[PDB]
């Protein structure tokens, strides 16, 4: 068939009518971004020749090709670690959440680390790690998955307990229904709207987080 | 180590910042040469409660440097002269 772009939506425009929203949806969406690759190193001499000494004697006639290939692969290998360092190590303080999870009805158990798991991952992060399945060597990454999970846990604890203050300086504590009100005022909605409807916003946020986990568990 | 066998470095139980990266969380430093699991950051527990806030009473005007490359050396190679002269 000839494809159809989208459903037609004739907006009811006139010169003296406006549409004002009377309600809201707290919507959580996923964005997946690759950060690093597998750090591969190739012994050029062993890949071309193995253990044959006559082959290496003939390979010395071509000069420093193997040195250039090894140096390019070394640059890629250190670039992957630099990429992981720039992405995840944006804080030099390892923050923790308080033991009591009283955030005014807001539930973060699906994104906070699970103490029962030995990998110290969140249930969402555990599901993400479950859903991913001759001179050649594979160099291990400099940051292990446990420390990357620790960095994300520190970022989550900072953005839950301290707002955006930890990203600009010292972590200044603030209650989460106040942090949320500040975010509401950042998008141009008054604080009262957040405070009056705080139970509904917390329920919508928890439902959206559960739908995120269900959608990740149900989509290959 | 998980990266391989390290000979000539004394393994310690303390955690420091990474000076020379070994890999798989192992780093080396000179103080003799020691090898250790890196420390991510200084530990900090934020004193969260549902009715307390922290308000700054002072400020620091901080100037930081950011170095960004713009161009390279403009190199041209005569291909015929390079191959053949």
């Amino acid at each position: 068939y000839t494809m159809s772009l989208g459903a037609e939506n004739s907006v009811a425009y006139s010169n003296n009518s406006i549409a004002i929203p009377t309600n809201f949806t707290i919507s959580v969406t996923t964005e997946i971004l690759p950060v690093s690759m597998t750090k591969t190193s190739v012994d050029c001499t062993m890949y071309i020749c193995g253990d044959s000494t006559e082959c290496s004697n003939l390979l010395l006639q071509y000069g420093s090709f193997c040195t250039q290939l090894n140096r390019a692969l070394t640059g890629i290998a250190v670039e992957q670690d630099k990429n992981t360092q720039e992405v995840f190590a944006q804080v030099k303080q390892i923050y923790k959440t308080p033991p009591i999870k009283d955030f005014g009805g807001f539930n973060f158990s699906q994104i906070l680390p699970d103490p029962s798991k030995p990998s110290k991952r969140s249930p969402i992060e555990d599901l993400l790690f479950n859903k991913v399945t001759n001179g050649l060597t594979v160099l291990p990454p400099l940051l292990t998955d446990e420390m990357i999970a620790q960095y994300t846990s520190a970022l989550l604890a900072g953005t839950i307990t301290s707002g955006w203050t930890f990203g600009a300086g010292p972590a200044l504590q603030i209650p989460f229904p106040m942090q949320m009100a500040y975010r509401f005022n950042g998008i141009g909605v008054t604080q009262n709207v957040l405070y009056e409807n705080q139970k509904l916003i917390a329920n919508q946020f928890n439902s959206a987080i559960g739908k995120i986990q269900d959608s990740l568990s149900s989509t290959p | 180590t998980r990266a391989g066998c390290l000979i000539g470095a004394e393994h310690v139980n303390n955690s420091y910042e990474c000076d020379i990266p070994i890999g798989a969380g192992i780093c080396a430093s000179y103080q003799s040469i020691i090898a250790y699991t890196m420390s991510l950051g200084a530990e900090n527990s934020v004193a969260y409660s549902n009715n307390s806030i922290a308000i700054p009473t002072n400020f620091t005007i901080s100037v930081t440097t950011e170095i960004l490359p713009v161009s390279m050396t403009k190199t041209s190679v005569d291909c015929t002269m390079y191959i053949c002269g």
């Binding site: 071509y62 944006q90 300086g169 | 806030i53 002072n58 950011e66």
Partner: protein
């Protein structure tokens, strides 16, 4: 090691040039790496073969050099587009983007020329000397809920004030810095305090 980013580019370009110059010393399987030696030693039927081996080796070396030069040119172009974005948004204006123009709340920036590069001096505002206060979302007065227009309600233990969020400057909670929305029955954590009227 402060200027290592520019020196890395300079060292990579100089090392690529040195490798390309060094590749002329290789014979690539021929009898010699010097073209004049082959042309002065051999008849053209076999000098054609030796020169052909030298040509394909040097052409492979030159194509390799041009390939990483184009890759490094793409990287430097991306870095220069980033630098132009920082020049537009941090120097020619004040940016709300976090950590785009330095660590902290960005105030302004200064450009400085550098050999094959630019150095941005980011002047930023860092909060310091923080102090605990007891806070509330709203003030209950005369059956009405009062919310701060731009600040936040704080208490030093006995008295309630309203202050701006990034600096401690306590002021009397009045009708001029608060607004009224609803009663006190809905907001969780509302406290009782008087609201002054000028």
């Amino acid at each position: 090691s402060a200027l290592g980013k520019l020196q890395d580019v300079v060292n990579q370009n100089a090392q690529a040039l040195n490798t390309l110059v060094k590749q002329l010393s290789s014979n690539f399987g021929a009898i010699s790496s010097v073209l004049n030696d082959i042309l002065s030693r051999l008849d053209p039927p076999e000098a054609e073969v030796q020169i052909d081996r030298l040509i394909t080796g040097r052409l492979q070396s030159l194509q390799t050099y041009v390939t990483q030069q184009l890759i490094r040119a793409a990287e430097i172009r991306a870095s220069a587009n980033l630098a132009a974005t920082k020049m537009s948004e941090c120097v020619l204006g004040q940016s709300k983007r976090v950590d785009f123009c330095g660590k902290g709340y960005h105030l302004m920036s200064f450009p400085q020329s550098a050999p094959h590069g630019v150095v941005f001096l980011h002047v930023t505002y860092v909060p310091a000397q923080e102090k605990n206060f007891t806070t509330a979302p709203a003030i209950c007065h005369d059956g009405k809920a009062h919310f701060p227009r731009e600040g936040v309600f704080v208490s030093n233990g006995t008295h309630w004030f309203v202050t701006q969020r990034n600096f401690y400057e306590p002021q009397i909670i009045t009708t001029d810095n608060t607004f009224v929305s609803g009663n006190c029955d809905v907001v969780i954590g509302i406290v009782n305090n008087t609201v002054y009227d000028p």
